[PDB]
Design a protein around this ligand. Structure first.
Ligand SMILES: NC(=O)c1ccc[n+]([C@@H]2O[C@H](COP(=O)([O-])OP(=O)(O)OC[C@H]3O[C@@H](n4cnc5c(N)ncnc54)[C@H](OP(=O)(O)O)[C@@H]3O)[C@@H](O)[C@H]2O)c1
Ligand SMILES: Nc1nc(=O)c2nc(CNc3ccc(C(=O)N[C@@H](CCC(=O)O)C(=O)O)cc3)cnc2[nH]1
Ligand SMILES: [Mn+2]
Ligand SMILES: [Mn+2]
Ligand SMILES: [Mn+2]
Length: 159
């Protein structure tokens, strides 16, 4: 089973200039809980944005060019990325925009955080047909002293 996890600002913005400009610790804690002990697939730009291996997860990087770091697994196509994960229950795809586009048709579940923030960005989450997806979990949180915007965690499953 393939799942995508992402955090979206208004208008589905996910990034600007290879970064995420907001800071929502509760969302990063949600990301860690839902990815720990699973393989994570990311594109090369996202790998450079994170800047280090994510501990406790098998890190698989898509790139057309040879890898430059043996602390992670480098693959050259979508099918190779999936194969490198082996026989696990759930594969997590953690972006970015181009990678989300390619795995969306293959995904059974979406873990989405909707952030109430207006962000100029240059990268968007793919348009997804709403009729294809059932919301199975949602949890709204107001802003607090640690998280400066309100946010909604949502899990959707392909119907
Ligand atoms: N808000 C969120 O949840 C979230 C999550 C993740 C990322 N982001 C943001 O997303 C942005 C990065 O997204 P992006 O769309 O620019 O890049 P990306 O999807 O992270 O990476 C694209 C690169 O991945 C490689 N790639 C993708 N598909 C491939 C394939 N089928 N075969 C071989 N290589 C492949 C290519 O690397 P080569 O050029 O080396 O071939 C491609 O240039 C940043 O702003 C980041 O902060 C946000
Ligand atoms: N829901 C969600 N929110 C995000 O911000 C997000 N970001 C990415 C890409 N960027 C990043 C950047 C940093 C870390 C990171 O350092 N995570 C630590 C959290 C501990 C901490 O620094 O607070 C981790 O161990 O997972 C992960 C993804 C991919 N999917 C996401 N999904
Ligand atoms: Mn092939
Ligand atoms: Mn197998
Ligand atoms: Mn806000």
């Amino acid at each position: 089973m393939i799942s995508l996890i992402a955090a979206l600002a208004v208008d589905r913005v996910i990034g600007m200039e290879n970064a995420m400009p907001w800071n929502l610790p509760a969302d990063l804690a949600w990301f860690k809980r839902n990815t720990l002990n699973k393989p994570v697939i990311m594109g090369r730009h996202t790998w450079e944005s994170i800047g280090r291996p994510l501990p406790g997860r098998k890190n698989i990087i898509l790139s057309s060019q040879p890898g430059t770091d043996d602390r992670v697994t480098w693959v050259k196509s979508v099918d190779e990325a999936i194969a490198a994960c082996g026989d696990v229950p759930e594969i997590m795809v953690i972006g970015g925009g181009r990678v989300y586009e390619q795995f969306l048709p293959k995904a059974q579940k979406l873990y989405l955080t909707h952030i109430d923030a207006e962000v100029e960005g240059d990268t968007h989450f793919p348009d997804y047909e709403p009729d294809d997806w059932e919301s199975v979990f949602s949890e709204f949180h107001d802003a607090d002293a640690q998280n400066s915007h309100s946010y909604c965690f949502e899990i959707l499953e392909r119907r």
